Amino acid sequence: AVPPSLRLPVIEAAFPRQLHPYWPKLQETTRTWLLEKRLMPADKVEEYADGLCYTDLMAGYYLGAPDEVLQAIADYSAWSFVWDDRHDRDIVHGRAGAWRRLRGLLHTALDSPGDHLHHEDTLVAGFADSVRRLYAFLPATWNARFARHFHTVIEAYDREFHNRTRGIVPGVEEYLELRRLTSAHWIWTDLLEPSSGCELPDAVRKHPAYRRAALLSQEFAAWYNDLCSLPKEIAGDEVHNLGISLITHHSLTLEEAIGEVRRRVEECITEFLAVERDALRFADELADGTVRGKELSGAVRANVGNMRNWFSSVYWFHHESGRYMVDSWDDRSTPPYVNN
Ligand SMILES: CC[N+](CC)(CC)Cc1ccccc1
Ligand SMILES: [Mg+2]
Ligand SMILES: [Mg+2]
Ligand SMILES: [Mg+2]
């Protein structure tokens, strides 16, 4: 029963959830990976990992992915949550040097992951293992695009480190631009391609309908995270959230800000419904009778179908995951699943 302020009747009615058939094995295999890579302590893995629903989030998204592709995506996604937690803890504890060194290591590992599989920082080693596996599915040109995108993500996290240590809340437009990077919009968009087995040509993935559908799926995911994660973030002195920027820069009340974020999220849905018609028409057009055309058509159709699945997977994840259940914590500023 979704809280009334967070409920989206259009998602519930018109975006039925899907779940990949590999999910049961995925749940246990990513938990074992978090344990074996020492990304969380064993007692915290046992108590909290399944309840965090990280594998459920990806298995509701990349439908049709080969099992090995889904496994690498799920491990990387769980890694990305643990990295968000490390970044938060380094900010809270004023560990500017530790963050700077981790930032530099991630840039280097991203370009040479095999070299870093046994690094002394288990967070770097776990990153490198997941990225090396993601780099084994498609040509080097896709790997280079993933790396270009993630270098940009790392730098967006560095900007957040400086904003939070200096007390700065970004302006609304500044925030919206930063949030496309901190939520990793273009990484999730890149990962559609190994999931459907095809690196798309620039001419296809930059088609305006593919681009706009991809963008709106990610804006929904990030802004719905902002809507649902606002309480945990206020409690933890996090400043990065569309609602916080609106309160600060536009002088809205909390209630006014939550309503404006919710309206922005609802508009993403109905803008997506419009452009989805065009992106599926484009998938139809690619099927021109040729073998290549059929391949590209099926890949675009699968990817646009997963851009739609992201809406329902992200919506339910925020009500199922222990990650956001701040009311259940003894110390609302310190989630129990982080290493403090
Ligand atoms: C910290 C996790 N994330 C990606 C999973 C940062 C890249 C933001 C996010 C959280 C939840 C749903 C959508 C995005
Ligand atoms: Mg966070
Ligand atoms: Mg973050
Ligand atoms: Mg958030």
Side-chain angles (χ1 to χ4, degrees), residues 1-6 8-24 26-37 39-45 47-119 121-172 174-176 178-248 253 256-261 264-280 282-293 295-340:
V2 178
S5 61
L6 307 176
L8 298 170
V10 177
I11 302 296
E12 296 177 353
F15 289 72
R17 296 187 84 162
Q18 289 192 46
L19 184 67
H20 195 289
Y22 186 63
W23 178 77
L26 190 77
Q27 181 188 52
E28 180 160 338
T29 299
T30 296
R31 191 201 320 127
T32 296
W33 187 78
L34 294 173
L35 190 63
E36 290 184 347
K37 299 298 185 190
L39 295 170
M40 292 169 57
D43 66 336
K44 292 193 181 188
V45 180
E47 196 173 4
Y48 302 130
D50 288 355
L52 292 169
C53 297
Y54 301 159
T55 64
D56 309 48
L57 178 64
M58 293 299 114
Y61 183 10
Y62 290 112
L63 278 295
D67 300 342
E68 172 170 45
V69 170
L70 190 66
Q71 188 67 59
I73 288 175
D75 293 348
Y76 169 79
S77 305
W79 177 87
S80 83
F81 283 104
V82 172
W83 178 46
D84 197 66
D85 296 341
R86 167 77 73 85
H87 171 253
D88 175 75
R89 292 295 92 177
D90 284 344
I91 293 163
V92 171
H93 295 303
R95 299 187 301 229
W99 168 256
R100 174 177 48 75
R101 286 187 284 281
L102 172 70
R103 167 194 179 205
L105 285 166
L106 298 172
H107 281 294
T108 303
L110 179 62
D111 294 328
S112 302
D115 293 0
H116 293 82
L117 296 180
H118 303 278
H119 194 270
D121 185 341
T122 54
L123 190 65
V124 174
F127 180 69
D129 178 72
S130 72
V131 172
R132 196 207 55 80
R133 286 149 60 211
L134 289 173
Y135 283 181
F137 297 129
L138 289 186
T141 44
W142 182 92
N143 302 346
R145 165 162 41 106
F146 179 101
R148 177 165 56 81
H149 286 156
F150 197 72
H151 284 296
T152 297
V153 175
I154 292 161
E155 288 305 289
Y157 272 57
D158 194 62
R159 287 196 301 286
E160 287 184 321
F161 192 102
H162 305 303
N163 287 339
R164 276 174 70 188
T165 65
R166 304 164 187 165
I168 299 155
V169 180
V172 169
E174 180 192 353
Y175 174 75
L176 295 168
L178 174 69
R179 185 51 165 155
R180 303 185 179 107
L181 311 179
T182 62
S183 193
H185 279 27
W186 310 124
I187 292 304
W188 309 119
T189 305
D190 291 336
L191 290 169
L192 298 163
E193 289 171 51
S195 293
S196 55
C198 182
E199 179 183 7
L200 295 175
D202 286 351
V204 170
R205 70 188 191 85
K206 299 183 175 183
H207 183 281
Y210 192 98
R211 286 277 224 205
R212 178 58 64 165
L215 167 67
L216 291 166
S217 177
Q218 297 306 331
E219 299 283 58
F220 175 87
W223 303 346
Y224 197 67
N225 172 266
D226 288 1
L227 188 67
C228 295
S229 70
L230 184 64
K232 134 182 124 79
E233 292 177 352
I234 294 175
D237 294 316
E238 172 62 274
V239 299
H240 297 105
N241 185 297
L242 177 58
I244 304 177
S245 289
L246 287 161
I247 292 172
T248 302
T253 65
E256 285 163 351
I258 287 161
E260 172 70 14
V261 177
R264 289 167 181 241
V265 167
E266 291 182 289
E267 210 153 314
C268 280
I269 304 168
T270 47
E271 291 189 24
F272 177 83
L273 291 172
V275 73
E276 178 188 33
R277 295 201 294 182
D278 292 325
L280 294 173
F282 175 51
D284 293 342
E285 291 159 7
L286 286 162
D288 61 359
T290 62
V291 174
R292 176 65 165 171
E295 175 185 28
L296 290 175
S297 177
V300 168
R301 184 178 320 276
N303 295 359
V304 174
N306 285 344
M307 295 174 194
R308 157 175 283 273
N309 290 326
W310 200 206
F311 284 79
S312 56
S313 196
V314 161
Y315 178 78
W316 292 109
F317 169 73
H318 281 85
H319 313 302
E320 291 175 340
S321 181
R323 183 171 175 85
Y324 306 102
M325 302 180 168
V326 58
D327 295 336
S328 70
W329 307 337
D330 289 336
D331 176 3
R332 292 175 58 89
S333 68
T334 310
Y337 50 82
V338 311
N339 168 8
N340 198 35

